[PDB]
């Protein structure tokens, strides 16, 4: 495969970046390549581990007040485990929501306990390890077919990993858990792609399109919920419409926001873990070889290292409910605080060799699924299984699959997205 991308020397730290060249509040910065971004967070960890940044202006989104950026692992961990101080209300991105966004985006992820946990308990059983293990057959059937179709669909042995595997595998699994008919899965995926791609001109930059997509997926959720209210199915949509929280059924807004949260999170995270993982295997072939020659033994550590390496969710935001000082920086009640998982996951204070992609890494206390605590990723067991099966099917059917171009990278501060990744195999 002479068209494979260049390999890299594992363990090489990126050069640190002069602090004057770092603008977290500019979309231009998020367009820099990932070596520069990684070197910039390295500078912040060293020189300004907590620092303040203006919010990025996005068309039709309210920027509002700026935010305190926590770039060190210990601070991101602390903030995550202290939700009475670091609240998830009113929003978990840096920007402000509005009443009009709240119709569609006012889910449990932007609420504190106890209401957060009462909402989460409606669906939590479906995401537990023992229940998710039950659907291995479904994950395998879909992954196996997708990889086979990459082969059958491309006589030239060239494919886009994202559209042909990494995207459609998690999409199928979450949509089927929700109870969405197959004929509408791609419609769901287009809506979630726009919702968490906004600001990249390849996805959407007109706020009117963002609002029409949001209204359209909400109307879809409401219509499916209405069907399930009358005729139950064994799906999460039926669980949502049947549940009672504080003795009251969920409202239309609550059902639509819950539905949207689950399909967005399901569709716009694992795909990037998978795609960054194939990119990493392409750059570090010794790691591919060692996983391929002991797939079951290394899989638990390998999947977690892929998540640490990719950090598919770049950050989450909190809002202080009281004044607090951290690292000698006083922050005030009401201030926004951003938790940079991408940076925690390269912190030398926690990982001695953070720049080494090591599929055997153990322990691996990465914060790719967050810092732990009340909002710890509901889908973590699901995502780990999706990743493990995707790589197993690639190993079994096309073991030498390799990237042939550098990825087209999503322009986003929030999601470490890959839009396309050309691959080949022999
Ligand atoms: C590798 C893929 C994934 C990554 C990196 C990831 C990461 C995260 C992160 C960082 C959070 C915030 C945690 C916190 O605030 O402490 C989160 C929350 C969440 N994720 Fe995941 N996620 C992944 C896959 C999924 C999947 C497949 C689903 C399925 C629907 C999902 C559903 C959720 C939900 C519902 C929440 C909100 C939980 C709550 O507020 O209690 N995620 N995820
Ligand atoms: C502003 C807030 C938004 C707009 C885009 C979609 C967001 C980010 C919601 C989205 C459903 C959360 C996805 C979480 C997932 C990346 C783990 C929550 C708040 C929403
Ligand atoms: Mg093609
Ligand atoms: Mg079904």
Swiss-Prot record:
Pathways involved: Lipid metabolism; branched-chain fatty acid metabolism
Pfam name, any one: p450
SUPFAM superfamilies the record matches: Cytochrome P450
GO BP terms in the entry: cholesterol catabolic process; fatty acid omega-oxidation; methyl-branched fatty acid metabolic process
Keyword line: Fatty acid metabolism, Heme, Iron, Lipid metabolism, Metal-binding, Monooxygenase, NADP, Oxidoreductase
Its EC number(s): 1.14.15.14, 1.14.15.28
Residues holding heme: 377
Keyword NADP annotated: yes
This protein's record includes keyword Lipid metabolism: yes
Co-factor(s): heme
InterPro entries: Cyt_P450, Cyt_P450_B, Cyt_P450_sf
Gene Ontology terms for molecular function: cholest-4-en-3-one 26-monooxygenase activity; cholesterol 26-hydroxylase activity; heme binding; iron ion binding; NADPH binding; steroid hydroxylase activity
Annotated catalysed reactions: a methyl-branched lipid + O2 + 2 reduced ferredoxin [iron-sulfur] cluster + 2 H(+) = an omega-hydroxy-methyl-branched lipid + H2O + 2 oxidized ferredoxin [iron-sulfur] cluster; cholest-4-en-3-one + 6 reduced [2Fe-2S]-[ferredoxin] + 3 O2 + 5 H(+) = (25R)-3-oxocholest-4-en-26-oate + 6 oxidized [2Fe-2S]-[ferredoxin] + 4 H2O; 15-methylhexadecanoate + NADPH + O2 + H(+) = omega-hydroxy-15-methyl-hexadecanoate + NADP(+) + H2O; 3,7,11,15-tetramethylhexadecanoate + NADPH + O2 + H(+) = omega-hydroxy-3,7,11,15-tetramethyl-hexadecanoate + NADP(+) + H2O
Family under the similarity heading: Belongs to the cytochrome P450 family.
Function of the protein: Primarily hydroxylates the omega-carbon of a number of methyl-branched lipids, including (2E,6E)-farnesol, phytanate, geranylgeraniol, 15-methylpalmitate and (2E,6E)-farnesyl diphosphate. Also catalyzes the sequential oxidation of the terminal methyl of cholest-4-en-3-one into (25R)-26-hydroxycholest-4-en-3-one (alcohol), (25R)-26-oxocholest-4-en-3-one (aldehyde), to finally yield the carboxylic acid (25R)-3-oxocholest-4-en-26-oate. Cyp124 catalyzes preferentially the oxidation of (25R)-26-hydroxycholest-4-en-3-one diastereomer.
Annotated protein name in UniProt: Methyl-branched lipid omega-hydroxylase
Organism field: Mycobacterium tuberculosis (strain ATCC 25618 / H37Rv)
């Amino acid at each position: 495969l002479n068209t494979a991308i260049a390999t890299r020397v594992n363990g090489t730290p990126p050069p640190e970046v002069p602090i004057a060249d770092i603008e977290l509040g500019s979309l231009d910065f998020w367009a820099l390549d990932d070596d520069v971004r990684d070197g910039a967070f390295a500078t912040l960890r060293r020189e300004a581990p907590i620092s303040f940044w203006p919010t990025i202006e996005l068309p039709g989104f309210v920027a509002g007040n700026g935010h305190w950026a926590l770039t060190k692992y210990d601070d991101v961990f602390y903030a995550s485990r202290h939700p009475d101080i670091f609240s998830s209300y009113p929003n978990i991105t840096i920007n402000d929501q509005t009443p009009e966004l709240a119709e569609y985006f006012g889910s449990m992820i932007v609420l504190d306990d106890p209401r957060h946990q009462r909402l989460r308990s409606i669906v939590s059983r479906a995401f537990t390890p023992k229940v998710v293990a039950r659907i291995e057959a479904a994950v395998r059937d879909r992954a196996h077919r997708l990889v086979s179709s990459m082969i059958a669909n491309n006589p030239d042995r060239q494919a886009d990993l994202v559209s042909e595997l990494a995207g459609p595998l998690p999409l199928q699994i979450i949509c089927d858990m929700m109870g969405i008919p197959k004929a509408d899965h791609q419609r769901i995926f287009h809506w979630t792609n726009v919702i968490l791609g906004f600001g990249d001109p390849d996805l959407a930059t007109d706020f009117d399109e963002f609002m029409q997509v949001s209204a359209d997926i909400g109307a879809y959720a409401t219509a499916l919920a209405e069907d399930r209210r009358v005729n139950h199915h064994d799906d999460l949509t039926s669980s949502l419409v049947e549940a009672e929280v504080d003795g009251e059924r969920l409202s239309s807004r609550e059902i639509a926001s819950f539905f949207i949260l689950l399909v967005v999170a399901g569709n716009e995270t694992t795909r990037n873990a998978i795609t960054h993982g194939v990119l990493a295997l392409s750059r570090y072939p010794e790691q591919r070889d060692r996983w391929w020659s002991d797939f079951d033994g290394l899989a638990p550590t390998a999947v977690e290292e892929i998540v640490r390496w990719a950090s598919p969710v770049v950050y989450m935001r909190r809002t202080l409910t009281q004044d607090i000082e951290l690292r000698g920086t006083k922050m005030a009640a009401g201030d926004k605080v951003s938790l940079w998982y991408c940076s925690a996951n390269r912190d030398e204070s926690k990982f001695a060799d953070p720049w080494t992609f090591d599929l055997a890494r153990n322990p691996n206390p990465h914060l790719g699924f967050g810092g732990g605590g009340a909002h710890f990723c509901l889908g973590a067991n699901l995502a780990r299984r999706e990743i493990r099966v995707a790589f197993d099917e690639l190993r079994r059917q096309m073991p030498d699959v390799v990237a042939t171009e550098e990825p087209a990278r999503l322009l986003s501060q929030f999601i470490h997205g890959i839009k396309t990744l050309p691959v080949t195999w022999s």
